[PDB]
Ligand binder design. Structure first.
Ligand SMILES: Nc1ncnc2c1ncn2[C@@H]1O[C@H](CSCC[C@H](N)C(=O)O)[C@@H](O)[C@H]1O
Ligand SMILES: Nc1ncnc2c1ncn2[C@@H]1O[C@H](CSCC[C@H](N)C(=O)O)[C@@H](O)[C@H]1O
Ligand SMILES: Nc1ncnc2c1ncn2[C@@H]1O[C@H](CSCC[C@H](N)C(=O)O)[C@@H](O)[C@H]1O
Ligand SMILES: Nc1ncnc2c1ncn2[C@@H]1O[C@H](CSCC[C@H](N)C(=O)O)[C@@H](O)[C@H]1O
Ligand SMILES: Nc1ncnc2c1ncn2[C@@H]1O[C@H](CSCC[C@H](N)C(=O)O)[C@@H](O)[C@H]1O
Ligand SMILES: Nc1ncnc2c1ncn2[C@@H]1O[C@H](CSCC[C@H](N)C(=O)O)[C@@H](O)[C@H]1O
Ligand code: NA
Ligand code: NA
Ligand code: NA
Ligand code: NA
Ligand code: NA
Ligand code: NA
Lengths: 248, 248, 248, 248, 248, 248
């Protein structure tokens, strides 16, 4: 099995499947003070950009599990291209209930927390793989500012305003779970632009090539509506970041 | 050991050590559809009013653990007075890490969640005592409305506004923990008045009797300031309720 | 025929199918100054709680018509349980166009006014059964405060904001129909909680028992979303009450 | 002498001539921790509901003075009906300057403070009857929220906004007089509804019976206008409560 | 009998006794798609401008009843002046309870609904004269925008804000009565100016001619105050229109 | 081919298929200073009211293309009725890509700009038919005021708020295209009422005649909801006008 086809089409040219730039991803690697040889587990690892670049830049080793066949293949090509295939392994499969045999120094789920039914569930899962004194990484949305209506929330892929919290309350929610927040690297509007806008070029080039595809009608509708939807709703209201956690 | 002396002085005449009336407490018992013989565990059971009245009215049995020696003694006198000592047992002691040998149908912590380091920790503790298909009860504050300043928060015994959530987000926080909210009974302003205002009469009568006590100066200052503090801050801004939870 | 199955599932454990507590229902009985022997007609009588309790407490007699087979059966069991079956009769059927042969002192429709196509139509219908000098009872929603968006209205089971009025304008609407408002008993937030929150426990227990039912998917979705929806929309914005009317 | 006829007509069926329910009145009795044998003086005692019910429920004894002949007669019938005539005495007369020979444990004026020219004057009067260590009870209005215009104030039976204070400032005003506030029981909107709405049924039934009375025109005008006036002005803006005071 | 003298003085030179221009009145005639021979009943027909002009322009026939002797005489002169006396009949008298013997295609009350005690009563009366498939016309005020204070309402000849509704809620009120709104023609500020400002010239010319009349003092006061009152209150806040209704 | 059936049903009795009165349409003709013999092309000409009335009043000649068979037939009957069939020709067909052989003095698209994929596309198309020094006419919506939510936009037949602009920005958009705005005639609320309200009478009369039509259910739902929807959304927020353009 796989993820739905439309995601593979829309994000086929993304290295990072989230609102983070390469510069943010490198900032995060350095913020974690990763040492050579550190072991990383990444559940929902996308196209392996985090593991591949940290292997290259910090000498880490690790494993990435992802449900997408396409993105798994990209991750493997990426590790070859960077010269780090010896350090990082990519597995195509479902990461639900995944627990590592050898403990890791960093256990991450960067924007895939439905794997264990939400943020708390995912933290509990990742904790099972974690070396005492290690770090858990959660990549998650929050309100950059509070939407004025529930409709802005539904245009940001939530059901209600209560699905997300403003940053102080979101940070508080990790504390209330039992964790210290020990680091964080947040998206800014420019990093959101990178994630969203790149989909538009990808979609248009796909559409030009696939005018009689069963999905061409749907894609054409998305391409038409997305820039304005994104600018009106997401760009102003939706925050995102990676939060580093250690259990008290 | 015990709780600090000032709490015993201020609340010596309270049956319910929270912003709930007798009528709210009975509403809660009926809302839970308690059957005769149902087993209840109550961590931080106060003066045993919940266990004693539900024993009388619904035929439940149970155990209440409380750190206060005074309130434990009151709970035992209450059970005798109601004719339910055969059904409900009160233990003087620290409820931290308390796990029941026999499972219970209802496992409760009504305004004492620091016992396991917060709401999530306490839910996890209570779950260890719970019969499959049972209910967890959490009695907790939330924002009735959002304070306009951090100072209102500090006047409501929080450190920051982020310590509490508005009701929709608070309900969402239980869902995000993995629980369905299956019932709730909330304080209203009248029930808050019962909890707070009763302290003033108690304090004044204590003060009249104990003019040379080491605490008389402190109590005199509290009595003077409390009604206005309460009316300005708590009465308008601070919500409270009991939430009934079942793990999904 | 019957009402849709989902209502029978959700409300199977409700005595009162509206945002009124037992205490509100008793307040209403006393507010009407009901005399022993007074005759009451109740169209859309639910589980007969109003007729049964007023029979017990005030010595009234009457008839309740309801389309639900389940709720009719409950009403009949309730009258037996209270010792008032001699005083109150429950009929399973459609109350549209129902006119009593003997006149009544109180003719009521408590939250079922679609029976005669709305509030005005229902008042006109009930008037046909009414003794000169009798009282008409209408149980109806109104805006507790004005929603800020049409979406809050649609989340409160209206189509538009104009479907309901703020209380002064709603009271004015009865006056403009030709009636004096002679009494009223309104829901508060606690009574709304009783009506809504009780559905959640009922639904969860049903779901646990009926995992392969054709409705399990729908019920699971409702249970997940309802507490937050209710707290965000209904609890703050939607009013409800019973209004007592006499024609000028 | 007597009170004006219109008040006797409008309130002839009220047990409590203020925005308090029976449940609030009983809450107040218990909040005061009244002991059997405690002596109560009630100036402007209405229909004696406070004295009669506290005699029945707490074993108090006392005296109620009221200017209304009707309400005095009702109070005497009430004490007989409850079996407490031996404990409570009702006197028809003017309570201005009334000082008790035997001291009392509770000296009350519940919504009649014009007797001594206002709140401060009335407190000073009641203090003359009070046992050292006793409680003074004042039943008084305040702003539940601040009216936006002087016209809302005049529709709430004040002359100006400055006639009343918001609750914190009102509580402060007792402190500034020299008293600790030691307890309080406040009206809510439901208790206001009980007080106001009951007048409408009373008025309509009176009007039906007295179509050619000199007051029928005035009463008809009041009945027409009151529900909307009440809902627009009083229900949202006007607070009321009973405050228990002890001199510092 | 007649209407009070001051109205006859103020409006003696008006053809249309409402905030409608001739152009609005003609728009309304065409909007109703009146056919030659259609029968119209007009209760409170003023100076007969609606009947006379529709007779001339659409070939309708009809009857107008008005309580003013003056305005009845004007209506009769108007029908002669337009050459339509054969088509339209004006009757001086009270239109309360008026029911036509022959049914009509259009039954109208344009700003005189106190005749049957309000909008609903008047609709019910007009319905008695109506051919199945005919139209009822109601000319009524509503809030163009919501006044900020009750005083603006009293300056617009209402008692309270709740006397009128904003247009969406007003339209909803007809729907809730059982009627489809099938057409409407609304006043604008210019049509209000025509109705109000014309009174000022009339009043001044009357005053110049009648300096010792018993009403000269009152008229002088009105003339002085009206333009500013009108501009401050009515022109911005008060809406008006004619609504065409058909029973569902 | 044709337009969908529902439009033909709803607008069968409209001469002007837009929020313009006859008086606005005549104002526009005079504003353009049309000379006898001037040639006009009208793409999406509706029922030909613009061409027919300008032929009659200004002596213009022209051609109207419309996709509706019904509205084309009406246009031809209209030209006969006005005595201008010699001057104006109506063609049933698709106006997309339509370019005139003889140049015209006025090239118009009045509320049909989807013909060339929007305002800019339509201007470019019309320009191909235009005599140097001629005028292009575009009939288009804009925001009369900015909706407070995207839902108001969707209730005004847009997808997002960004679909339309406030008038200054809308006028700027023509300037930014390369055109001077040389004249304009805008709808007001009364002209919107004419366009929308007339649909309600048409729909009701259709419904009365066609109770078993496949569309009766849909039409009944529209008739019920439209007046309130229109008053809440369109009447206050949606602007419309005809803008006269000359290329710089
Ligand atoms: N059950 C599952 N197990 C593993 N991966 C899953 C999954 N469900 C979804 N995914 C993957 O979760 C990812 C979410 S996008 C984030 C990917 C990556 N962390 C990055 O930032 O680039 C997708 O790559 C998708 O393929
Ligand atoms: N570590 C601990 N173990 C058990 N009880 C504790 C405790 N720390 C505080 N408490 C108790 O927690 C209670 C908080 S007040 C709430 C008490 C009770 N549930 C009621 O509603 O009336 C106090 O009674 C206090 O004695
Ligand atoms: N046409 C109809 N005739 C009679 N009852 C109807 C009906 N349509 C719906 N109902 C009933 O109307 C009720 C609405 S709920 C309110 C029920 C009751 N008055 C109470 O307050 O508890 C339901 O019990 C439903 O069964
Ligand atoms: N001068 C006076 N002396 C005694 N009673 C007076 C008075 N002037 C007014 N009253 C009484 O003051 C009362 C005010 S209403 C409040 C009555 C009562 N405390 C209750 O809550 O029900 C009326 O009963 C009226 O008769
Ligand atoms: N009881 C009654 N019966 C008939 N006409 C009445 C009436 N009471 C008032 N009127 C008339 O109602 C009218 C209100 S003014 C509106 C008049 C007319 N429809 C127009 O628009 O011009 C006045 O002409 C007044 O004379
Ligand atoms: N492709 C197309 N070619 C020509 N006319 C079209 C069209 N698509 C829609 N229309 C027409 O465009 C019109 C939009 S309504 C406006 C019509 C006219 N200008 C008036 O103001 O009255 C309708 O008459 C419809 O029939
Ligand atoms: Na940036
Ligand atoms: Na309350
Ligand atoms: Na309450
Ligand atoms: Na209440
Ligand atoms: Na105008
Ligand atoms: Na206008």
């Amino acid at each position: 099995m796989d993820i739905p086809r439309i995601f593979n089409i829309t994000e086929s040219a993304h290295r990072i499947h989230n609102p983070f730039t390469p510069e943010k991803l490198a900032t995060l690697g350095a913020a974690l003070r990763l040492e050579a040889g550190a072991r990383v587990l990444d559940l929902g690892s996308g196209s392996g950009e985090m593991l591949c670049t940290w292997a290259r830049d910090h000498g880490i080793v690790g494993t990435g599990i992802d449900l997408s066949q396409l993105f798994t293949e990209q991750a493997k090509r990426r590790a070859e291209a960077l010269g780090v295939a010896g350090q990082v392994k990519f597995i195509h499969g479902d990461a639900a209930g995944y627990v590592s045999d050898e403990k890791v120094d960093v256990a991450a789920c960067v924007g895939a927390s439905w794997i264990a039914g939400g943020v708390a569930g995912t933290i509990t899962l990742l904790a099972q793989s974690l070396e005492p004194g290690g770090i858990i990484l959660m990549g998650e949305p929050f309100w950059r500012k509070l939407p004025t209506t529930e409709a802005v929330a539904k245009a940001c892929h939530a059901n209600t305003i209560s699905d997300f919290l403003l940053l102080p309350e979101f940070l508080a929610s990790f504390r209330k779970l039992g964790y210290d927040v020990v680091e964080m690297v947040l998206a800014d509007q420019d990093s959101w632009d990178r994630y969203e806008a790149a989909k538009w070029l990808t979609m248009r080039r796909w559409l030009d090539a696939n005018p009689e595809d069963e999905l061409a009608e749907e894609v054409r509708a998305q391409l038409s509506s997305e820039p304005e939807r994104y600018a009106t709703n997401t760009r102003e209201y939706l925050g995102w970041g990676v939060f580093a956690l250690m259990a008290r």
